[PDB]
Design an enzyme around this catalytic site. Structure first.
Site, PDB file in Angstrom:
ATOM      1  N   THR I   1      27.477  -6.574 -41.543  1.00  0.00           N
ATOM      2  CA  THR I   1      27.249  -8.013 -41.571  1.00  0.00           C
ATOM      3  C   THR I   1      28.255  -8.741 -40.694  1.00  0.00           C
ATOM      4  O   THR I   1      29.462  -8.632 -40.901  1.00  0.00           O
ATOM      5  CB  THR I   1      27.336  -8.572 -42.999  1.00  0.00           C
ATOM      6  N   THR I   2      27.752  -9.481 -39.710  1.00  0.00           N
ATOM      7  CA  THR I   2      28.590 -10.279 -38.831  1.00  0.00           C
ATOM      8  C   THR I   2      27.929 -11.627 -38.604  1.00  0.00           C
ATOM      9  O   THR I   2      26.769 -11.695 -38.194  1.00  0.00           O
ATOM     10  CB  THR I   2      28.817  -9.590 -37.487  1.00  0.00           C
TER      11      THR I   2
END
EC number: 3.4.25.1
Lengths: 213, 197, 204, 123, 216, 199, 219, 201, 199, 198
Positions: I1-2
């Protein structure tokens, strides 16, 4: 996780004479190996004739003192008179006990004069048991103080020696010297000394210097 | 652990129990009587944790005595068994679990003699004879051998003395003296206490 | 802890030309007494003694090893042992056990065989040598014996005053200890002679 | 719930609900009793018997415990409550005190119920 | 409990007629330096100054509560303003009541203030331990800049405003050297009778020339 | 702890930080993480200092015999394996991590990550707990065929980004330029550290 | 426990604190932490009491064999290797934390050895429980190339700040100065707390001792 | 902590020692374990000092409420049941108390043992505390219901004297409380150490 | 997750990755982490999806009443606080972390990190487990006063560096340009992702 | 737990022990004899873990019997006590710890009667009387009250019967039958087994 209780040190000594009751403690407030401050009086005043010490976790010493001083006023407003030394003991026995399942960690030593005008010392435990005695101690140095008093105050282990009730003139130098002896050999004691003497006239607070290391 | 026993004859129910009250390594009270009388012809026998036995079995003795005063007639030994269960069962999942072991012994004008077994999980069982404690292992074997449905009171006490004197040989705990009671159409009757001086 | 199993107390205080060592007589297992005849102070030869405290197994185990190593040392050498050399022996004895330590805190007291010179010291589980010019204590009641010895001790004392000082030091410190008691044995080491006295103490 | 004052005072100081309650007793079935030496006797008259009734279920002389009995005169619907409440106290007393129930002890508890229901909200 | 964005040491020391509080501008998540510009020193009314350590999420909660406490107080206009001893004794109870419920706010706070010619520097703790000292630090500041402050106060119990900031710059300089989670930018907020004044982000001139000594 | 190495034509540039931290406190403020295993070979320490200084000394010994007995400078592949065997054998007991970079007369500049007992040759290598934050700088800013003046400016800019984000890293950057002529040891003081977005 | 060291122009200076504590009590108020390795080399133990002593004994004995074998002044870099490979051999179980310093003909050198074997050369450092206090005083007032007369006060003020500010450090301050001539030891150089007075003597008259078994053995 | 009680022809006798300690270090010495409740009712102390001291004050409170309400001067049997019912509601929360309730009611010289979990036992002879086992030995040494008054105290002394001698957590002074029809009376408070060297010579 | 957000003059660019992974396996390959809380306000989900989708819906509700009752578009500071109160109250039970970015008629573009119950206004913000891998690109490559065409190229280049290093990140980048005129949704497919150093 | 006792008279040592061998909730062997004879005038009494008692006490019985054959004279009760300790002590820290409780009872031509106490940690003590097990708490109190150094073997057995019959009242475990032996200048002598036919 979370450890609610920490040992802040401190030492309390009480001696009940005929006309006098002495409650003395050091000023050092230290958590772990670090000293937070070198003035933190353990002795707290309740009434004119009653001084209470609190030795243990400092956050409970501050909370319990504000709870006692709150019920001193609840009593003084309801009964129109100040609590006797014996009544403060019986009350604080039930105060400490209402925490039975999450106890206050503190060692309370109440001292002063009773209705008879004689020195009355009440030593407690965190769970709220209490018994009257001539001399008590508390805190980290409690183990060092008690044997010295059994000899000088109690005249024990000495065959054919006269029993003279302890005099305030000998009591002043007796409280100072056991701390000069305790502050040396104990790391949680030193940096200063407060002696609060409770007589029929009033409370007299006397400060004594101790080893600073 | 404390010891209970019971035996059902055709006309009678012969129950016995140990009189020992023990704490730690010593025997506090040697005459302690574990036989609780629920009603005239209904007894009860409770062993287990020292505090849970008297506390629970007194809750039953009052509910049974209360029922007799409300409706004018006492409970039958059957209804008194299923009542002790539901109370002991409801207390399992709550915050106050009871650990007890019961024997409900009674006589009835119609159903006749009855003897009930119960464990600390409140599982009710009606057996011709039953026992509790560690002494229940060394005893119920003897009861298996000599028991018969036609047994007579005269034989029953003699049969009971064969069982109880073998707790003095193999069984490790002392148990010097055993209380004995018998129930018949005429009500509860005490019998001479078995004692091994 | 483990050293609190059998309890026990040992004390040593140095005088001017003389030293004194004391210990209680009680032998017990936790809360139960057994006998009052137990011996916590052992002769190392003339004018030299050693006390032992802590677990009562290691008191007799460590002691039998010292009389083993001492008698070897005194037969090899043409002279009696110096009390300073004995400190390093017991330190080496306990340090070899570093990873399986004996539970005990030796207390050494005696006189330098040279002329008058007194010597005392104390050790730890690991045997760190610690030399003091006043007193040493070891045991479960050690906290008590500090306060007693602090106030009573003086720089120079004649033998008469050592005994009075170390007697009241033990008797009062032990009465506040639960696992120690049942009489106290006090030894006095002079240049001329040795005075042994068993005190009458509260039985409790 | 329903909380309202039913029993209240009056300009004459009289409680109407308590006085009207005693009016229910003023027509009862007459109940009497006397004390002897070792014996004590209770009695009641029933004018409602048509010979069709079952005399056993209408008995107004009950027993609270082995050592104590009682009668009543008034509205019979209310007696079944007090009695069933008194019988609970007799057994809870033997549970608290191993001794049996004193005749006076169960008379207090019957009176403490008739008090609370006088001052309670909406009773 | 959960590692959510701890603070760092907070230095303070009372000088003649005032109190100065220095705190890093670095928020620290775990061992990271994540949020490198934050104000960890809150202005409370005119005369008192707060800055904290430990969990920063719990500092904005107290920033929000004390905000309402002081704003609700100003709304009445009664002339009463919380003295820094009341703000201190109020936090001591908030920290303690959260403790006795076993749901503590994990934080350490230093309350500065100057009122009625009396400089109040004060300290509270997660567990409710609270006291008042002439010089304070939190976290490892108590192990580092604390003996730097005490060593001056023993010799010179009376410090001026110019000597104060100089000694604060030195102690912040030592923390930059000797503290892992510290950072170069920091705020020096000095409260005096003229009111709370928060100086902009500052830095420290550092002497690394001993790196050549170690080499030879 | 942040260590870095970059490869170019003539040789390699071995960068590192200084600060050594036990827990949240700083043991040593200025500490040299480059320990030469041999004249042209350098090892950048990482991980546990007690475990890394032991492996760096054992590797400097076993390799010293390798230098004398061959009467010739050892390769960098020889230095990376001596470090790998010690790291993998003790890998339970020793938590240390090293990086081997240097120059040889055969293949020229080399850089070998020894992490956890494995071995790679890499054009540029980063290590230590402070490595992770600069995985975006070294991907973008890196270009092949950089001059020694550009590599030193690439290594300096990179570590300077790691020291600011990492709490366990900081201090002065060490730079050793190893070429055929010799070894140039520089030190980048705090005033020479390249400035990057402050806020 | 607080020990510290400093490098100045001509040599090094090693300080120490004299108090030793077990649990919380003061076992001995006068204790030597500075040990003797070589004539010009010393060191300071901090850690487990005997583990910091026995360890310096083995080094002091090995360096005496080495000095007699070679016939040359002992190098400071050698003592560090011996203490470093001994402590790492025990996998950190030994808790000895040492500061080694001395002047060989290479010039003043000051090392420090951590219990796990981690050793760093540097100008100044402090170890022990009060290390955080002493280092903080060293950081601020340090500067390269100090004269000897100005180098003693900075170390005294470094340890004194570590004594007065720590519960594990007390007593006097030991200091050891080393130069080209070297081997100059100053014991109890500083006394942060002078007063120790305890006047009210409890000395009592002999003759009250409920004693029973008394016997005497001539010699 | 050593405590004992026994009943005979002329009524009950209660004997305790004074010492209450925490760990190896003795906290206090002369602490009075026996707790006075009514004039003729007498309680004891075992286990946690604050727990039994607190709850036997409630029993002192409930016995007075009973005597004020009913006026029937509560019997020993019922007073033993009140103390058990109060301890049964808090079961599982870690309250540690032993206890014994002595007195003379209409029935006779009743004596009971009330425990932390609700154990309630009448009987002739009881002892509690850590040194309880050491008491039964000397008490069973030929105690008989036919003993006189003086012969009975000599057993009470000699029981505790030998009980605290063998037990390191028991000691101090022996407190002896005789019981009669009217109410209890304190026989003596005497040091163990002084009685030891008596019986030893 | 970014997740990422950048501020410029006219508005903000909110970037994010796609891949949602439970453990070492990929639950959802293409997932939209931008959940609009209002017309011009967008929230970038991070952390636990079950906890973040609950907070994002509760925040979209409480804020919806705020929009109707004021009869006016809410600010971004209002959106960041509704998210902060929910995150801090449940912080024991909910491990979620969000990021609030949008545009308003007053202050213009705004970006607020809500992490762990705290609040900050930031010119550029990165979040998620993949954000730890680039602090070096956003420190260097970032410059103040960038045009919308430069910001979208800065956000795209940055996340593309995070997806390659992070194992829990990957997939297509989402880009929402929020200005006063409206919201421009853009999706960057794998073939449009900027190429960086491959090895 | 199993029960031991001993009493030292001026000319004699009177020891007794329980004959019960118990496992789980049952009594396996009621006549089990726990009195191990080391030499003519030297007995031994060992209780503890069921396997460690017989295993250890047989290692001693052979070393004592071996010493008498080597040097022609038996060990004295003093040397036999300090020998059992060192063996039991050396075990403690090894990989085979023994859990035992010993009583060494013996008579000597010179030293006279002797009685030794020992615990599982090998702490040796010489007492005039001693006991082991949970029955040692209910007994040693009685021994304290009636013991005298001048006691006669006629009184001793009568004194021993006062102690052992009080394990039948308070003590919870059965212990129906107790073995009793006496030692004098003429050697070991058995006495009539105390038996309480429950």
């Amino acid at each position: 996780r979370f450890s609610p209780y920490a040992f802040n040190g401190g030492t309390v000594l009480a001696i009940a004479g005929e006309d006098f009751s002495i409650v003395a403690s050091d000023t050092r407030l230290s958590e772990g190996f670090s000293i937070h401050t070198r003035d933190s009086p353990k002795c707290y005043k309740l009434t004119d004739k009653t001084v209470i010490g609190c030795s243990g976790f400092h956050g409970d010493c501050l909370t319990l003192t504000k709870i006692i001083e709150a019920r001193l006023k609840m009593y003084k407003h309801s009964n129109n008179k100040a609590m006797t030394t014996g009544a403060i003991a019986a009350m604080l026995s039930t105060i400490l006990y209402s925490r039975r399942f999450f106890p206050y960690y503190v060692y309370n030593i109440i001292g002063g004069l009773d209705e008879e005008g004689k020195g009355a010392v009440y030593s407690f435990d965190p769970v709220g048991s209490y018994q009257r005695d001539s001399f008590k101690a508390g805190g980290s140095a409690s183990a060092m103080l008690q044997p010295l008093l059994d000899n000088q105050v109690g005249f024990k282990n000495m065959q054919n020696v006269e029993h003279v009730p302890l005099s305030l003139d000998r009591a002043m130098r007796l409280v100072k010297d056991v701390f000069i002896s305790a502050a040396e050999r104990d790391v949680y004691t030193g940096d200063a000394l407060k002696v609060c003497i409770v007589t029929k006239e009033g409370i007299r607070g006397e400060t004594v210097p101790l080893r600073k290391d | 652990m404390e010891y209970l026993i019971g035996i059902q004859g055709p006309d009678y129910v012969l129950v016995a129990s140990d009189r020992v009250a023990a704490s730690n390594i010593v025997q506090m009270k040697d005459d302690h009587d574990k036989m609780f009388k629920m009603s005239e012809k209904i007894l009860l026998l409770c062993v287990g944790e020292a505090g849970d036995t008297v506390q629970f079995a007194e809750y039953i003795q009052k509910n049974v005595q209360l029922y007799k005063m409300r409706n004018g007639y006492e409970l039958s030994p059957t209804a008194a068994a299923n009542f002790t269960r539901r109370n002991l069962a409801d207390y399992l999942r709550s915050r106050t679990p009871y650990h007890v072991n019961l024997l409900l012994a009674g006589y009835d004008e119609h159903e006749g003699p009855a003897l009930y077994y119960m464990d600390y999980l409140a599982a009710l069982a009606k057996a011709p004879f039953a026992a509790h404690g560690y002494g229940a292992f060394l005893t119920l074997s003897i009861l298996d051998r000599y028991y018969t449905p036609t047994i007579s009171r005269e034989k029953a006490v003699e049969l009971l003395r064969k069982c109880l004197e073998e707790l003095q040989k193999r069984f490790i705990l002392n148990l010097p003296t055993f209380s004995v009671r018998i129930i018949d159409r005429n009500g509860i009757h005490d019998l001479d206490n078995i004692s091994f001086p | 802890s483990i050293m609190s199993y059998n309890g026990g107390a040992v004390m040593a205080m140095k005088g001017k030309n003389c030293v004194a060592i004391a210990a209680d007589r009680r032998f017990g297992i936790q809360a139960q007494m057994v006998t009052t005849d137990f011996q916590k102070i052992f002769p190392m030869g003339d004018r030299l003694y050693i006390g032992l405290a802590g677990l009562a197994t290691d008191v007799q185990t460590v002691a039998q090893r010292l009389k083993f190593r001492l008698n070897l040392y005194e037969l090899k050498e043409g002279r009696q042992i110096k009390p300073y050399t004995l400190m390093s022996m017991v330190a080496n004895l306990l340090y070899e056990k570093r990873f399986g330590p004996y539970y005990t805190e030796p207390v050494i007291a005696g006189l330098d065989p040279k002329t008058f010179k007194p010597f005392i010291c104390s050790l730890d589980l690991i045997g760190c040598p610690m030399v003091t010019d006043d007193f040493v204590v070891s045991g479960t009641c050690t906290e008590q014996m500090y306060g007693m010895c602090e106030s009573l001790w003086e720089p120079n004392m004649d033998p008469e005053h050592l005994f009075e000082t170390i007697s009241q030091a033990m008797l009062n410190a032990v009465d506040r200890d639960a696992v120690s008691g049942m009489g106290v044995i006090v030894h006095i080491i002079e240049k001329d002679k040795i005075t042994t006295r068993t005190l009458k103490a509260r039985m409790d | 719930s329903y909380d309202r004052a039913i029993t209240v005072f009056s300009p004459d100081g009289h409680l109407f609900q308590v006085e009207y309650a005693q009016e229910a007793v003023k027509k009862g079935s007459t109940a009497v009793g006397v004390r002897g030496k070792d014996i004590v006797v209770l009695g009641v008259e029933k004018k409602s018997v048509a010979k069709l009734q079952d005399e056993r279920t209408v008995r107004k002389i009950c027993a609270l415990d082995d050592n104590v009995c009682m009668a009543f005169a008034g509205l019979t619907a209310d007696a079944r409550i007090v009695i069933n409440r008194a019988r609970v106290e007799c057994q809870s007393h033997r549970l608290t005190v191993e001794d049996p129930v004193t005749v006076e002890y169960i008379t207090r508890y019957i009176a403490s119920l008739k008090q609370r229901y006088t001052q309670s909200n909406g009773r | 409990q959960n590692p959510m964005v701890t603070g760092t040491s907070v230095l303070g020391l009372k000088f003649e007629g005032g109190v100065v509080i220095a705190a890093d501008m670095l928020g620290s998540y775990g061992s990271l330096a994540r949020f490198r510009n934050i104000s960890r020193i809150m202005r409370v009314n005119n005369s008192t100054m707060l800055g904290a350590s430990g969990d920063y999420a719990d500092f904005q909660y107290l920033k929000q509560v004390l905000g309402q406490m002081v704003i609700d107080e100003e709304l009445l206009g009664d002339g009463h303003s919380y003295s820094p001893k009341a703000i201190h004794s109020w936090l001591t109870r908030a920290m303690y009541s959260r403790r006795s419920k076993m749901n503590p706010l994990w934080n350490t706070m230093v309350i500065g203030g100057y009122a009625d010619g009396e400089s109040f520097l004060g300290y509270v703790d997660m567990l409710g331990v609270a006291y008042e000292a002439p010089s304070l630090a939190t976290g490892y500041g108590a192990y580092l800049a604390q003996p730097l402050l005490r060593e001056v106060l023993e010799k010179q119990p009376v410090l001026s405003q110019t000597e104060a900031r100089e000694l604060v710059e030195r102690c912040m300089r030592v923390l930059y050297y000797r503290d892992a989670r510290s950072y170069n930018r920091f705020q020096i907020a000095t409260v005096t009778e003229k009111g709370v004044e928060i100086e902009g982000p500052l830095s420290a001139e550092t002497n690394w020339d001993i790196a050549h000594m170690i080499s030879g | 702890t942040t260590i870095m190495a970059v490869e170019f034509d003539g040789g390699v540039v071995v960068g590192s930080d200084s600060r050594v931290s036990a827990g949240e406190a700083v043991v040593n403020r200025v500490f040299d993480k480059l320990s030469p295993l041999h004249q042209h070979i350098y090892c950048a320490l990482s991980g546990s200092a007690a475990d890394a200084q032991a492996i760096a000394d054992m590797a400097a010994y076993q390799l010293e015999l390798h230098g004398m007995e061959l009467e010739e400078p050892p390769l960098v592949l020889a230095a990376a394996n001596v470090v790998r065997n010690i790291t993998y054998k003790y890998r339970e007991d020793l938590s240390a991590h090293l990086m081997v970079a240097g120059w040889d007369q055969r293949e020229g500049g080399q850089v070998y990550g020894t992490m956890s007992g494995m071995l790679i040759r890499q054009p540029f290598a980063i290590g230590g707990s402070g490595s992770t934050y600069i995985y975006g700088y070294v991907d973008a800013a890196y270009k092949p065929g950089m001059s020694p003046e550009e590599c030193r400016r690439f290594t300096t800019n990179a570590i300077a980004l790691a020291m600011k984000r990492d709490g366990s890293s900081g201090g002065v950057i060490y730079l050793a330029t190893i070429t055929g002529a010799g070894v140039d040891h520089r030190v980048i003081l705090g005033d020479e550290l390249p400035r990057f977005y402050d806020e | 426990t607080t020990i510290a060291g400093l490098v100045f122009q001509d040599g090094v200076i090693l300080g120490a604190d004299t108090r030793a504590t077990n649990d919380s009590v003061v076992a001995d108020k006068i204790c030597e932490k500075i040990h003797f390795i070589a004539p010009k080399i010393y060191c300071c133990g901090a850690g487990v009491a005997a583990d910091a002593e026995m360890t310096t004994r083995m080094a002091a004995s090995n360096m005496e064999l080495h000095a007699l074998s070679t016939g040359r002044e002992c190098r400071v870099a050698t003592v560090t290797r011996m203490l470093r490979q001994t402590l790492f051999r025990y996998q950190g179980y030994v808790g000895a934390s040492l500061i080694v310093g001395g002047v060989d003909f290479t010039g003043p050198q000051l090392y420090s050895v951590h219990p796990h074997g981690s050793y760093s050369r540097l100008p100044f450092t402090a170890l022990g429980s009060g290390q955080d206090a002493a280092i903080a005083v060293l950081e601020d007032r340090f500067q390269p190339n100090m004269t000897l007369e100005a180098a003693q006060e900075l170390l005294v003020e470094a340890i004194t700040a570590g004594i007065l500010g720590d519960l594990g450090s007390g007593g006097n301050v030991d200091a050891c100065v080393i130069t080209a001539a070297g081997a100059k030891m100053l014991r109890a150089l500083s006394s942060p707390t002078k007063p120790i007075e305890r006047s009210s003597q409890y000395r009592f008259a002999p003759g009250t001792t409920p004693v029973l078994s008394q016997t005497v053995v001539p010699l | 902590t050593t405590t004992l009680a026994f009943k005979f022809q002329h009524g009950v006798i209660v004997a305790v020692d004074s010492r209450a300690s925490a760990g190896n270090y003795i906290a206090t010495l002369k602490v009075n374990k026996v707790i006075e409740i009514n004039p003729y009712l007498l309680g004891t102390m075992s286990g946690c000092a604050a727990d039994c001291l607190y709850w036997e004050r409630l029993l002192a409170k409930e016995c007075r409420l009973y005597y004020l309400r009913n006026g029937e001067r509560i019997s020993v049997s019922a007073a033993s049941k009140l103390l058990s019912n109060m301890m049964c509601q808090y079961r599982g929360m870690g309250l540690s108390m032993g206890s014994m309730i002595c007195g003379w009611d209409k029935k006779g010289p009743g004596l009971y043992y009330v425990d932390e979990n609700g154990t309630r036992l009448s009987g002739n002879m009881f002892s509690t505390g850590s040194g309880n086992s050491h008491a039964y030995g000397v008490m069973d040494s030929g105690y008989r219901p036919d003993l006189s008054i003086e012969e009975a105290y000599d057993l009470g002394r000699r029981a505790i004297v030998h009980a605290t001698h063998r037990d390191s957590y028991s000691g101090g002074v022996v407190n002896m409380y005789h019981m009669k029809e009217d109410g209890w009376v304190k026989v003596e408070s005497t040091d163990v150490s002084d009685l030891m060297h008596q019986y030893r010579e």
